[PDB]
Amino acid sequence: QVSDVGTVIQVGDGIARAHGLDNVMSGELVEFANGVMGMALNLEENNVGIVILGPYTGIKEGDEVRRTGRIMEVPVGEALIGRVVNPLGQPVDGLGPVETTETRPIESPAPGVMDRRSVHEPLQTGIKAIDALVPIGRGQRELIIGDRQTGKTSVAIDTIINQKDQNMISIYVAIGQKESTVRTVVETLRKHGALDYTIVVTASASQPAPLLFLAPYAGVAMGEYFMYKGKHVLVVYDDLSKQAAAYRELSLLLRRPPGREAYPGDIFYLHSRLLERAAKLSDAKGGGSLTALPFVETQAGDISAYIPTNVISITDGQIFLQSDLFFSGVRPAINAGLSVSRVGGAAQIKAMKKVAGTLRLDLAAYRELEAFAQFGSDLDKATQAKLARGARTVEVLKQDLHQPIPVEKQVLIIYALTRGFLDDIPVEDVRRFEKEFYLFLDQNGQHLLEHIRTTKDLPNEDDLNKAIEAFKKTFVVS
């Protein structure tokens, strides 16, 4: 009895201390008489330190604590698809209980060195800028970093929406976000039909710190269930900065000595343990994969801060969203100079490699030249082959929210831009040209689209040039 029943000694700020529980094991789940769950953190000589995973106002000194016999676990299964749950797996949307059968531990070892394979499969986000300049492969960890209100959430929503026709399972984890924004995100996902393959895990700002700390681990544990069955999973962590702040709060409530910016010493280990679980499994282990897109929020665009540098040293590349470009109407505001994909390149299809090879450096050169060109004389080559081409490139890469583009249409429009077919089109109507070209391709260019889809390679240049010229003849400049 006493070996499985405890008594609370201290309660405060989500931290409890209990007497008894002789047979409790480290990391085990415990249950209070109030029904709130807790995690056994420290096993001292005469007492057990417990972290409360819920409202602690109902817990008073002298309350009963009982063992559960289970290490930290969350329910997993296909019945969890289309639902909104908390980090403990309890349903939140109010549509009834979840009929899962299996569970997975919160803490699990990452796949070993010999259990992995090089990334070789594209992840089509449906965004021209990302798919052209910063390709993402299945099994890659790609950081999305930017200031407040720079379009970070919109990129993830569009990426999730684009996975409708692909064998991909999406998991969206919102840490420290406002509940209204999560509600609207769920509504738009339902509107676009993404709930047929999406799991939403939410831990709002009003929730206690331990739930925010635990949410990403619950998400990755849910993803691993499909990952080890041979399937492909995409996991989005909407803010790792909120998790870092919550963990700092939890550590300082335990009186652990802080480091720089008051963060604890194991703040790097916190993120590394989570992000090492995304991998591309070898053929011997089923060939499944898990893709992670962590989010980091910067202050005044400072990429040299502690948390951004910690996350950058873990992932396989970063996508940088710039605030001034966003304010100037350039959306998405991807900074080509600072964005890079280490694993990408090998993930792109052959068609996209041919046309998008020089685009990164061309865009960077135009971006650095356009500031310098505000004064002095300019040579004809700079005016025509560089400034006009960069303006056309900037106009092409613009995109509207919640409107992903198929990869073949992106390849065709980028080929049209690169081969100079847009040089005589005025800058003011490049977007209308692009949309009318997309409309035209659906009727007269169907064979080119089918060839690109089937062979993943660019068609013959003669027929493509003929089709582009034929469309260009009927387009009106206005």
Binding site: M25, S26, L43, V113, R116, G259, T309, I312, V340
Partner: protein, 471 residues
Amino acid sequence: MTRGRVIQVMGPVVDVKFENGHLPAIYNALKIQHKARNENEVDIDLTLEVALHLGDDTVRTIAMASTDGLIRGMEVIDTGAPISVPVGEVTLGRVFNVLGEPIDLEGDIPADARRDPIHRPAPKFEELATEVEILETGIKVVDLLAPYIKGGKIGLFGGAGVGKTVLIQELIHNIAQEHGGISVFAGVGERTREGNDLYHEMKDSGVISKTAMVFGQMNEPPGARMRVALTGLTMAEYFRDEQGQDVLLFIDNIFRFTQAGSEVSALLGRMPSAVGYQPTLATEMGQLQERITSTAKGSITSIQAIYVPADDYTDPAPATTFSHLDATTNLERKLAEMGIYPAVDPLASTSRALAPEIVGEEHYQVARKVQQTLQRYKELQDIIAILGMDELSDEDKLVVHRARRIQFFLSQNFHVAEQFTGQPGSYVPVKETVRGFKEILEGKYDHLPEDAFRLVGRIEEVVEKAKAMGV
């Protein structure tokens, strides 16, 4: 009788109580092997290392794996010796973890093989060798301004995503494939993906026949990250001493060892240091570093990448590790953002080999002149930024003109970087680099555009690129 009991479990730190008069020594290894008695327990196979003697027959240890599932009162067995790992020819071509257990799925190691403890005192003063010889790497900036020393200790400093891994891979490609000795790689605290790629690269190149690898990546608990470097060092020391052979030692990120020590230090009961680090930072780092030396019996040359947190070079961990190195390479984020790779700082990087009697008079003079021009260009930065180039004198204008060319010519195209850009890359001998920089300093190429000097290799390729550009 060497049986103890678990008293406290606090993350990576576990307290064990032994019977009076039988306490294990410091650094001894303890084994916990528990079978689940019922459905409310889990199986445990865990190794602990003794750290402190707390008194009252209590010992505080550090766990080598996750402590989840531990229950107070479990039985602990003392092995009577520190962690021991296999050494010899059996380790060549294999991949090991921190405990010396192979992880390459090529089979187990026989139990009768020789094993050596991973803790030992550093070599004495009279056993050391101090000869200095140049190690050619084929990189222009390194060979010119801070030559590497054969048998010495080389450190690479940099922030996050600046290019330390690319540089060390290029060094492996240029040097290890024709070394003729033994190579050891220790991937402490880095990406598991990088370890998988490196293993396949070694297998394809065939270098793995003479290479031993011990990884212990960043997904491990802090206990494992504190000791894997010692395992790799023990394997290297065996070849240095018992066979008298030349050894290459690569350490992927030595800063993670200090970081793991800092993570463990707080739970051990030590009071925090200046920036939250452990009080014993310098002592621990010195104890690790002093074992990596060349002696009369054999030579070890080591290349270590050192992470700089938040790009702060005044951080205690990067600051204290400077005194242990013979040659240092400092990478800067500003140069990387400028597109200059390998982004080596030409003034912060130093080496003991840059002496007239070691590299020759001409090399020394050329390097010193290059550094002087770069220093003058750095001094003129505020004037250039505010008032522009118009107010400078004729002498300063020429200084800026040549400094731009010198700065761009220090960049190079790597063989490893071909996967990013598609450019094959080049290998430049030292004499060619010296001649090219001497010609640039003389004004022979003042008429060429400065963009022709980027990522070019030899000096003739500058002329070829300028001609192709239409000059």
